[PDB]
DNA sequence: ATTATGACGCT
DNA sequence: AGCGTCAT
């Protein structure tokens, strides 16, 4: 009862922009808007790999992994543009500017943590607080929320989209209790008023749409987020859990859309979120172990604690390509090549990251996957990162991993290298 | 031949 | 440390 926590103590959100690399490519090319449209990576092989999709060319069932040979046969008119291609590889140098142009016009609001390229989440729980008492407990209009949903409304007591939304939207702030500055639901609403502003803000300054959610924690958010996309924002109150929950996959949730939800959903033979509640914290950890167990067994009831964590930086540096089929590198040459083109983009952008930043990356680690293995990697290792300096790191690099050839000649490699990765982690100030 | 990333957990 | 999981 009284002394039974319910995980309504912060006002979390998730900004996650809509279809972020097609933005950034339809702001370049004013041809690309409101178009079926698709970004691309590579082109020889079947038209190249689709990687992002407009929300009109998704009508037609285009897809990110599809290769655009197949997404033209069901969108004929689908317009492409490519990725960057740099020193034989792909090159996501703009759309990581682009994205820091987001983080920082959502860094002005609070306190972020970049959760990808193009999404964070925002600690609002403190600006709610501000904005409450500037508020003077007058009541919250509907024109502040002008692009809100509140999931689980209307209910009750019609045909139209818009409409649908601006009847839960008044049922919601009809039933507001605004004089207490402690209400869960009035901050949460305060908080959607706040992620408005966020939005509108982005959109302004940088042309970028996107949506959000808005709730007590990271996961709620986060599954806010995606229930009314593009260009929506969605409010998901305690309230809201248990109805919701009722009927959502637990793939869905943050965390559980691979072997650990199967597992969930095998041992437990339940397929939705709101079926855990059925078992004790000591049922779960008894399956999924002491930390897994604590987790489902609160956020099957809408609480979990996970911080907004203060970092808008990434916390390594990295660049990677795939030598798929016959391209697989078989020979020395060929790999100590790659590894330089690898080593001088990372180059780049390490003595861009150290100019912007203050800080320098102190070890690199080397990863290589070999033909046949169907791991993401085969083999990691790391040496000391000592300079910026792209023929030292490929040396290096080269020198680390040289062990891994079986061939008996010198000049051969093998088995060949499908995959190469240099990644820049461990940062100090400077 | 579903690529190029990036965070965090386990032992 | 090196590997695995989950994610966008
Ligand atoms: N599996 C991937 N491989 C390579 N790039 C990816 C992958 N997933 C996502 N990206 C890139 C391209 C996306 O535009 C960008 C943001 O991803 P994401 O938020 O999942 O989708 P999106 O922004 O393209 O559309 P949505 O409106 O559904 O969010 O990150
Ligand atoms: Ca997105
Ligand atoms: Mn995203």
Redesign the pocket.
């Given at each position: 009862g009284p002394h039974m926590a319910t995980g309504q103590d912060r006002v979390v959100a998730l900004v996650?922009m809509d279809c972020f690399f097609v933005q950034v490519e339809q702001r370049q090319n004013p041809h690309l808007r409101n178009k079926p449209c698709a970004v691309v990576?590579?082109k020889?092989?079947k038209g190249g790999?689709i990687?992002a999709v407009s929300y009109e060319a998704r009508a037609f069932g285009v897809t990110?992994?599809m290769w655009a040979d197949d997404a033209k046969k069901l969108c004929p008119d689908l317009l492409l543009a490519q990725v960057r291609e740099s020193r034989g590889?792909?090159?996501?140098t703009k759309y990581?500017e682009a994205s820091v142009e987001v983080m920082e016009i959502m860094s002005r609001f609070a306190v972020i943590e970049?959760?990808?390229?193009?999404?964070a989440y925002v600690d609002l729980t403190s600006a709610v607080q501000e904005r409450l008492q500037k508020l003077q407990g007058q009541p919250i209009s509907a024109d502040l929320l002008p692009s809100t949903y509140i999931e689980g409304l209307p209910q009750g007591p019609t045909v139209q989209k818009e409409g649908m939304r601006k009847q839960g939207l008044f049922q919601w702030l009809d039933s507001l209790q605004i004089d207490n500055l402690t209400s869960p639901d009035l901050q949460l609403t305060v908080g959607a008023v706040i992620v408005e502003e966020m939005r509108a803000a982005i959109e302004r300054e940088t042309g970028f749409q996107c949506s959000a959610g808005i709730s007590h924690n990271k996961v709620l958010a986060?599954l806010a987020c995606g229930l009314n996309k593009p260009n929506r924002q969605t409010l998901v109150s305690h309230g809201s859990v248990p109805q919701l929950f009722s009927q959502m996959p637990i793939?869905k949730?943050?965390?559980?859309?691979?072997?650990?939800?199967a597992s969930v959903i095998e041992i437990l033979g339940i397929e939705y979120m709101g079926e855990l509640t059925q078992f004790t914290e000591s049922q779960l950890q008894s399956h999924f172990?002491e930390?897994?167990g604590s987790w489902l067994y609160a956020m099957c009831r809408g609480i979990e604690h996970d911080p907004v964590?203060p970092?808008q930086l990434?916390?390594?540096?990295?660049?990677?390509?795939?030598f798929?089929?016959?391209?697989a590198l078989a020979t020395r040459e060929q790999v100590q090549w790659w590894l330089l083109q690898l080593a001088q983009?990372l180059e780049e952008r390490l003595t861009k990251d150290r100019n912007d930043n203050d800080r320098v990356a102190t070890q690199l680690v080397v990863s290589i996957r070999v033909q046949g293995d169907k791991?993401?990697?085969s083999?990691?290792?790391?040496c000391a990162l000592t300079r910026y300096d792209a023929h030292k790191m490929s040396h290096d690099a080269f020198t680390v991993i040289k062990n891994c050839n079986t061939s008996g000649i010198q000049t051969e490699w093998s088995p060949p290298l499908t995959?190469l990765?240099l990644?820049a982690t461990k940062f100090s100030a400077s």
């Open positions: 996650d990576q590579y020889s092989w790999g990687i990110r992994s590889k792909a090159n996501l990581r970049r959760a990808s390229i193009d999404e986060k793939r949730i943050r965390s559980l859309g691979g072997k650990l939800g172990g930390k897994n964590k970092r990434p916390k390594t540096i990295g660049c990677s390509k795939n798929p089929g016959k391209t983009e791991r993401l990697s083999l990691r290792r790391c995959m990765f990644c």
